[PDB]
Subunit: 186 residues, 4 copies
């Protein structure tokens, strides 16, 4: 449920940051390429977070923008790749370099990074390439926002794209598109 | 344990809202019909929430008033219907339209919505109609507040209504009714 | 981990209170006898809490003082008695009345309350009477504080009382007693 | 995820402290040797914490500095030793005394403390002595910070020390060391 923290950077111990919100000091685990961009200790930072809930522990993974978080969330969906590994992948290379290596199927650039291997590198590339097709954008709009909303409700991507086509009126909010699209389907 | 959030709306990405409380950014999942009523980003919002705790994740579902939340809480009690489905039901129609479709047994209005079907639509109507009888009101008072309190303590609805009858004195707080009713039963 | 809430009472719906701390609205479940003593909506309240963590849900039980909470914590240790039942026991009678009924073995006063029975009433009395012997006090001091600390560390009650006797110097902090007692045992 | 609390000390009940952050009262369990150093009730305290998450409960263990917390975290990794026992070990002796007793293999100093025994005392000493070798320091630097970061990413300690040697340039940030070391390995 915790999507964003805004507070004072108390300490940096890569890959860990300690952000103070109120008087609560959150431990945020961040990939090294996001780590370089952090403000200075004593200054306010805004980090986008991904809460991983376990039975044994509760952890916050933090990123500087939503595109990096989505990438990380996409990455941990593939069997064999978890938060620590995803943290290492985005430490060894930026999000843009990772997407570029996925698109050009560079399965030699990723094999060096610890904990994955050769077959999982290959499976990661195949799988991520497939996931990027339907993924957001600007690294990988009202009408697109509206399809996403509909997919979130339970419609299948293609059928949601169908619904947001019939009433798709350029220069119109994503919400009215969702309202209009849902109205003419029930 | 989290029943209400009051903070600044940071971002809207239907059905998700990001509300900032202190410097903590909560991700709230809201049905589309509540979503339309939200203030503008940068303005304060008050949302009634339902915390769902899992072993893998922790989520907040948010509504603009308590009646919608109760409806949602009632809805997720029926096997086959979970938070995502309940979110879709209250996206496709308002709470009032849903109660009206339940009372008039319109099992054609709900069949269109994704993820449920025909038999579950039918079971939903039967089950919700039965639950509404004893449900709060104004969509579906000191004396009624007092019966509820007693049901919460473990008394059965009918016996709790019995207790709040013998001493039921119009123009008197629900608490004194609970105090008086509990006193003359022990 | 949440032991106390101090905030604004937003709504009362016995046995539920909604306390706002920051802009976070906590749902606190309180026994009716504590409920009567709450300030008025819009005014600040201080409630002592007991966090019950489950896999399905996370709940706060609240009391006006530490003695009531201890009683509640003691109560839920007995098989057959859980938070809802303990909530009902402290709703039907005050903490003082409950301790008095336990000491005088009144197993007719408790049998009326819903959800327990006759054998569990009897077992509750036997068990609570045994637990009160070693329990805190004022309803059921530096030297006593110090024994408690030592019991918490893992010493057995009798041996901890032994340790805080040899160096027990009236008119001296519980901490120095713990320091002195631990020093002369290792 | 909670690494630090900064708030007002409300009550002390060794080994428990109640720290108020906002209007939220956190129960922090602290070893007695850290307990002696706490400010006075009504004054601000800064405690370093270790959140233990269970299915039944959620607890905060607190320390005055990071070295004590690391020790505690190291301690609870050994089978037979849990938070309560670790709390007792750091109550009976300071962190420095404990490290000294580990280095000099004093397995008579620890045998007195309740809940452990003789074989676990012996195993604790062997195991802690082995863990201290690679452990931080000042009780047990940019280049060392950088190796730690790399170990956290998944590299093995020796190979991470190899990487931070080839480009190890005295008088240079730990982050650039991590950036430079990661660059010349992929």
């Amino acid at each position: 449920m915790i999507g964003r923290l805004r507070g004072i950077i108390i300490e940096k111990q890569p890959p860990l940051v300690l952000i103070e919100v109120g008087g609560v000091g959150y431990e945020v685990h961040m990939p090294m390429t996001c780590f370089y961009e952090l403000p200075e200790a004593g200054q306010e930072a805004i980090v986008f977070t991904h809460f991983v809930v376990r039975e044994d522990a509760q952890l916050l993974y933090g990123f500087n923008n939503k595109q990096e978080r989505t990438l990380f969330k996409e990455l941990i969906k593939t069997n064999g790749v978890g938060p620590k590994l995803a943290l290492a992948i985005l430490s060894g290379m930026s999000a843009q370099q990772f997407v570029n290596a996925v698109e050009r199927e560079e399965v030699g650039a990723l094999v060096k990074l610890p904990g994955i291997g050769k077959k999982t590198a290959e499976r990661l590339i195949v799988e991520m390439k497939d996931r990027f097709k339907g993924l957001h954008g600007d690294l990988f709009d009202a009408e697109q926002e509206a399809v996403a909303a509909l997919v979130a409700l339970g419609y299948k991507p293609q059928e949601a794209s169908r619904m947001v086509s019939k009433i798709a009126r350029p220069d119109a909010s994503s919400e009215t598109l969702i309202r209009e699209a849902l109205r003419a389907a029930l």
